[PDB]
Amino acid sequence: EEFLRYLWREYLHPKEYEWVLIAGYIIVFVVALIGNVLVCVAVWKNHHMRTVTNYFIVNLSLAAVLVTITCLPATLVVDITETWFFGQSLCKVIPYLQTVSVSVSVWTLSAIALDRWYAICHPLMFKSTAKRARNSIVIIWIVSCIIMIPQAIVMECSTVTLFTVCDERWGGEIYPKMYHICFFLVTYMAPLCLMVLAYLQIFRKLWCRQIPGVAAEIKQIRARRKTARMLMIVLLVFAICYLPISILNVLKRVFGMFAHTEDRETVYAWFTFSHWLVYANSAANPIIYNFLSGKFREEFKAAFSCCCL
Numbered sequence: 001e002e003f004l005r006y007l008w009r010e011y012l013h014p015k016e017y018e019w020v021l022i023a024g025y026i027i028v029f030v031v032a033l034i035g036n037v038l039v040c041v042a043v044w045k046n047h048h049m050r051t052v053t054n055y056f057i058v059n060l061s062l063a064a065v066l067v068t069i070t071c072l073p074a075t076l077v078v079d080i081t082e083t084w085f086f087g088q089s090l091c092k093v094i095p096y097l098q099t100v101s102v103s104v105s106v107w108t109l110s111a112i113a114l115d116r117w118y119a120i121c122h123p124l125m126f127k128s129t130a131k132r133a134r135n136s137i138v139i140i141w142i143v144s145c146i147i148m149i150p151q152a153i154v155m156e157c158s159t160v161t162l163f164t165v166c167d168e169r170w171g172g173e174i175y176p177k178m179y180h181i182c183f184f185l186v187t188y189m190a191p192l193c194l195m196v197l198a199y200l201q202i203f204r205k206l207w208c209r210q211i212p213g214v215a216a217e218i219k220q221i222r223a224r225r226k227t228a229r230m231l232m233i234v235l236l237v238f239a240i241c242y243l244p245i246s247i248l249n250v251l252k253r254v255f256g257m258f259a260h261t262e263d264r265e266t267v268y269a270w271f272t273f274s275h276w277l278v279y280a281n282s283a284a285n286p287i288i289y290n291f292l293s294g295k296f297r298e299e300f301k302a303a304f305s306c307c308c309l
C-alpha cells in the first residue's frame with residue numbers, strides 16, 4: 001500500500017533526474033565496497049604495510065563498509081521515495097550506525113594526525129605501539145557509540161497522498177538545537193580544526209625545514225613526505241565531502257532554515273547531494289590510497305591479479 005502511494009506521489013510530482021542518482025549510488029556502493037575490502041585485505045595480508053597509520057586506515061575502511069552495506073541503500077530509498085519503508089527498529093538502528101561511523105571516521109583521521117604530529121613535530125618523535133593504536137580504535141568506537149545514543153533515542157516513524165517518514169522527534173524546540181550544535185562541533189568543526197593545525201605543523205616540519213645529514217633520516221623524511229601528502233589530500237577530500245551535509249544539518253536543526261520556504265526542490269536537491277557525498281568520500285578514499293601510496297597500489301594490483309586469474 002505504501003509503495004502504491006509512492007507511485008501516486010511520484011507521478012503527481014515527477015522528478016527529472018532520479019536515474020542519475022540511482023546510477024551514482026550504485027557506482028558509489030560498488031566502488032566503496034570493493035576498495036575498502038581491498039584496503040583491509042592488503043593491510044591484513046602483508047606485513048610491510050602494517051603501520052599504525054594503516055591500522056587506523058583499516059578501521060576507517062571497516063566503518064566505511066558498515067555504512068555502505070547498512071546505510072547506503074536506506075539513504076537512497078529515502079532520497080528517491082521520501083518514505084521510510086523499513087520500520088521503527090531498522091530506523092532506530094540505521095541513522096545511529098551512520099552517525100556512529102561518521103564520528104568514528106573523523107576521530108580516526110584525527111588519531112592519525114595526532115600520531116603523525118607526535119612522530120614528526122613533537123621533539124621526542126614518539127613511535128606509537130600497536131597496543132596504543134588498538135586501544136585508541138576501541139575507545140573511539142565506544143565513545144562514538146555512547147555519544148550517539150540520543151540520536152537513536154529521538155528517531156521515530158511519523159505517519160504524516162501522504163507518507164510515512166522516520167525523522168527526529170524531540171520534546172522541546174531548544175534541546176534539538178543544542179544537541180545538533182554539539183553534533184556539528186564534535187563530528188566536523190573541532191576535529192577538522194585540530195587536524196588542520198597538526199598537518200600545518202607537519203607540513204612546516206617536512207617541507208619547510210632543512211634536509212638532515214644522516215641518510216636514514218633522509219629516507220624517513222621522503223617516506224613521511226609521501227605519507228603526509230596522502231593524508232592531507234584525504235583530509236581535504238573528507239572536509240569537502242562532509243561540509244555540505246554538516247552545514248545543511250546546522251541550518252535545518254540549529255538555525256531552523258528551509259522551513260518557511262516553499263522551494264523544496266532546490267533544498268531537496270542540495271540535501272540529497274550532500275547525502276550522496278558522504279558515501280562518495282567513502283568510495284573515494286581507496287582511490288586516493290591507490291593513486292598516492294605505492295604499497296597500496298602494488299597490493300591492489302596483486303589482489304586484482306589473484307581474484308582475476
Ligand SMILES: Cc1ncc(OC[C@@]2(c3cccc(F)c3)C[C@H]2C(=O)Nc2ccc(F)cn2)c(C)n1
Pocket residue numbers: 071074075076078079094095096098099102245246249275278
Ligand atoms: C536519508 C538521510 N537522511 C538524513 C541523513 O543524514 C542526517 C544526519 C546527519 C547529519 C550530519 C552529518 C551526518 F553524517 C548525518 C542526522 C543523521 C541521520 O539522520 N542519518 C541517517 C538517516 C537516514 C538514513 F537512512 C541513514 N542515516 C542521511 C545521511 N540520509
